[PDB]
Amino acid sequence: GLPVFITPGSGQFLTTDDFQSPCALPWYHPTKEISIPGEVKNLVEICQVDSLVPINNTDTYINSENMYSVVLQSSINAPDKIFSIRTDVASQPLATTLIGEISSYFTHWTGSLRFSFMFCGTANTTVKLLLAYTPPGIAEPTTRKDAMLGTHVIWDVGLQSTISMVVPWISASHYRNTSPGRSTSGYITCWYQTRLVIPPQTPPTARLLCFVSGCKDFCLRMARDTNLHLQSGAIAQ
Amino acid sequence: GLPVFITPGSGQFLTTDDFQSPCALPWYHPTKEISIPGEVKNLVEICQVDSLVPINNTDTYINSENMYSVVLQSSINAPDKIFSIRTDVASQPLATTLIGEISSYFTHWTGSLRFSFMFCGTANTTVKLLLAYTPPGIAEPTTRKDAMLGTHVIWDVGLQSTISMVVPWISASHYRNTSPGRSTSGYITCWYQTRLVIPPQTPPTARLLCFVSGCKDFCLRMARDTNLHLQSGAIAQ
Amino acid sequence: GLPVFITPGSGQFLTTDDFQSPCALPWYHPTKEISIPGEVKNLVEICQVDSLVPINNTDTYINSENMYSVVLQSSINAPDKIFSIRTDVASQPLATTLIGEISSYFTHWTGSLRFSFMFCGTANTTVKLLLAYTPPGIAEPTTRKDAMLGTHVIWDVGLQSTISMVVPWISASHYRNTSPGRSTSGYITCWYQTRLVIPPQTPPTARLLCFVSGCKDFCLRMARDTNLHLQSGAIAQ
Amino acid sequence: ALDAAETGHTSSVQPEDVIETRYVQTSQTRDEMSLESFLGRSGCIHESKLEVTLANYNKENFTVWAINLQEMAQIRRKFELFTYTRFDSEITLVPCISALSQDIGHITMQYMYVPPGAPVPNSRDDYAWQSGTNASVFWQHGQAYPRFSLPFLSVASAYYMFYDGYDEQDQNYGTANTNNMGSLCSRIVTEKHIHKVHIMTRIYHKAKHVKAWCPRPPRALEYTRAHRTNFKIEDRSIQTAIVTRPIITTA
Amino acid sequence: RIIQITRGDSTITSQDVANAIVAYGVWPHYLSSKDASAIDKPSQPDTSSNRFYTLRSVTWSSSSKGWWWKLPDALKDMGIFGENMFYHYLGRSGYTIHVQCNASKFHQGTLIVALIPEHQIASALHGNVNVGYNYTHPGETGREVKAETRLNPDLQPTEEYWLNFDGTLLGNITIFPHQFINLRSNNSATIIAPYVNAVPMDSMRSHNNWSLVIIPICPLETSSAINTIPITISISPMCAEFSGARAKRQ
């Protein structure tokens, strides 16, 4: 036979290998691909989907819809903070979003994130609000003016339902690690730019729902078996 | 399958082998090479760098800058020897130079060496000095006239700072072994060609610093895990 | 991978194999071949060299030059035999010649052999001599006339120093075995064709030296680790 | 022949200046001196020693090692020669079984590259031995040496050989910040069996398709602390590669 | 052997100097669209910060042992440069550096100046220790080298200058772009460098992407009563850029 000689890396199985292989079932033929709707080629189209943050991750809301929602108080003359979050894609709560899980299935990420926000309160009601981002190396802001020094948007709550805005990609490195240990990507932070004003005898309350998705900018590397989910023992049947 | 038959040298690992190998991480893609400054292709560009000899390798200077330096005595009417060294690239002290270490990482060497010398004394001061080389098979010289029979340079200490000169390659063989055991390459030797003259009430002293590098002529073979450095036990972390 | 299947003769080492093999020392480069004199391509050029037979292989001469030489007796009015030898290339003494050793390193031989002879006696002296060969299947001759029936030369000892002559290749087979066991190739035999005549008060003596080499006709096969030399135990160092 | 070394530029360059030379075909290749040579020879990197524990075979019989080039001196000193370097990696495994018992039988062994934020195996029975996308690879008694090609990994252009600061809240100064490659892992795949054995893997690598960035001076003294350039060892003194002599006028 | 220098608004000369080698020959430049990571159009203060600034006077003696700085931290207080650095998560800049060191015709001694990369300093103490931020980031105040009693020693860097503070031999330090102040050769010395990193731009306050070292290779002396001379260093940043604007960093 041809004189051949064998390199190391022979005779192993690697779960992430790439090769031809022989057939168990020669002469077989598969069923034809009918034109089923809902084609897909990549994970990024899933990233493009807006999904809700369970923003309001606490005991009093977790076992319910309400952890996707925040409640606003039209009673308050103040500039102050409504909420804040990290921005690291596999941090809590963001990891629990589908982009979060897809990022949690991965080790590297890059590109800017889309964020979106609906004024879910009574149609008769008005406000304008500050949604802001904090470039890190610094504490999460404690005045509205701090957030005004960050990159931010002021929401003209017009007839249109939703404000949508982007955390710009400002990683030193072209990628960042998907889960921080002792590390940070920056903060989302939210504030009363005006007070919220309902008209008289409206419910003394309002709701806000918050969305995120990958921008056209977004991408991942180092697919890894995700942090997000655990199996204990045998899966019964 | 094709009739094949297997030669010896199969199934070993050689730390110095050469082959293709299969990927652990298929479909991955590396980060782009940005145009970082400080490109390199070969070790010879490092050889081209002048580095100081720790010429003055003794107890009284070793734990300090001063082993890179020699002190001259303007008080002396004499022709006599200032210093001398071997020329074998991996001999002490030369081995400790970066060309020394690179040679110490290697078994064969060839080509002529550049040597350079600054009159580090007071700007007002004058001398001319003999830098000389001894072709071996012979003892290291004991008169200045001996060195004058060797290949040598007399330093016109003009406005210009430095004299630079070459030990010619005069190996019988096109290469020489990088470290001698019971063997020799020749000597550097240094002498008062004139007395050193300071003008009155100058410091009664002067300094000289000495440099070496590979010439355009220089090259190495048989890269080997260097003599120069030792690991004892485990490297802790 | 390609469907392959393995023939016997795999996985052995044969000291006389032929193959490519992988490098222990990739990227290395050898020293250039300078034009050293004394080129060689084959063993036959060594065969072409005349070397002396230690013709006179006995106790009284062995530990000396004299076993290369024979002594002639100008005192004798006789036709009779001066010496005789086998012709089998690896027989004693011929094996000890360099063609002998080269043949002893081999199992088959072919082609005619050159033989040569100098009248080493006093320049003033004259003779003519019979050098003869015996085609075998027969005893070594016991009269000069017997040798005269064999193929032979009568030496006109003119001004010129040497007679040179050939045992013709008369093997039944195109080759013969290099060493005979219970076998024979024929004889060299030497005789006084005239008496040897010195002029008066010359030394009562003469010398003859004898040479052999491969002719242009000569060749070998089945290189084998030679009979001629033995190692006992370990070779010390 | 005269210059100002103080310029920073290398000194008077030319050998023909001070020797009346004959023409010579100086014709010796620098190719062994290439980076794809000098980096591009393999060497050992780390030592995966394990004992097969019996009493909880299912728990203990695995190891994990933080990937670095910083704890075998020769390889370390190749890379401790630059600011940064980039390469693809031949990786080669030299698994060895040592018997503490009359036989070893058949044995099979797992390895996994654990990139950071993969769930680290806690147990020789951990579900983390499943590896749908992690590079995991197998060896067993009588099998040839495993190898794989690992491409250049970094989030940056090149690996930091050194770094001059911190992860942003200011600890782990230097490479312990930048060089989070995660870890290699190993684990016995054969189930519980009677043979007390040690498994040792020597792991090797060669950098090829190499590039390197701004050379820096070689390490002068014994290593000490992997990521950290520390060298002043405890109850010890700084005995460098330089050796002293009695007088500077004697060679 | 004369030069004049002009950056952003400010100018420098020596009339006894040999020109800088440009580090690796790469004259400083802005990032490229081909290589960049950051998405914004970044902050170009140009003339208002690619201009000179200079450090407090050090001074030296025959007894002196060495000095160094880490950049950009050594310039954190340089007005526009300093705040533009502190207000961004990232930036990049090269540097032009000149060291000012005149003596009389009647002095001897020499310093080596080395520009140096990440220069990852070793601890003073043995064992499980590493350098603390206060010392890696000395600011413009820098690190002179001294014989004694630096507190928090476990977090101090080593003082071992001839081991380059990292366990590498001095004298091979000429591997980097470097010059000598030699009092005969010159009265000043100069070096210029582009930006560099494994990354197209970097977290300025978190990582000293360049460093600068000056060492008394040969002892200062004169017979004159002026037994000591100051040294000072001036730097201009080059092509300086900043990205990810937010609050001032603490």
From Swiss-Prot, chains A, B, C:
Transmembrane segments: none annotated. It is found in: Virion; Host cytoplasm. It comes from the Viruses. Forms an icosahedral capsid of pseudo T=3 symmetry with capsid proteins VP2 and VP3. The capsid is 300 Angstroms in diameter, composed of 60 copies of each capsid protein and enclosing the viral positive strand RNA genome. Interacts with capsid protein VP0 and capsid protein VP1 to form heterotrimeric protomers. Five protomers subsequently associate to form pentamers which serve as building blocks for the capsid. Interacts with capsid protein VP4 in the mature capsid. Interacts with protein 2C; this interaction may be important for virion morphogenesis. This is Capsid protein VP3. It comes from Human rhinovirus 2. The chain holds residues 331 to 567 of 2150 of the full protein.
Curated annotation (Swiss-Prot), chain D:
Residues 1-12 are annotated as: Disordered. Transmembrane segments: none annotated. It is found in: Virion; Host cytoplasm. It comes from the Viruses. Forms an icosahedral capsid of pseudo T=3 symmetry with capsid proteins VP2 and VP3. The capsid is 300 Angstroms in diameter, composed of 60 copies of each capsid protein and enclosing the viral positive strand RNA genome. Capsid protein VP1 mainly forms the vertices of the capsid. Capsid protein VP1 interacts with host cell receptor to provide virion attachment to target host cells. This attachment induces virion internalization. Tyrosine kinases are probably involved in the entry process. After binding to its receptor, the capsid undergoes conformational changes. Interacts with capsid protein VP0, and capsid protein VP3 to form heterotrimeric protomers. Five protomers subsequently associate to form pentamers which serve as building blocks for the capsid. Interacts with capsid protein VP2, capsid protein VP3 and capsid protein VP4 following cleavage of capsid protein VP0. This is Capsid protein VP1. The chain holds residues 600 to 850 of 2150 of the full protein.
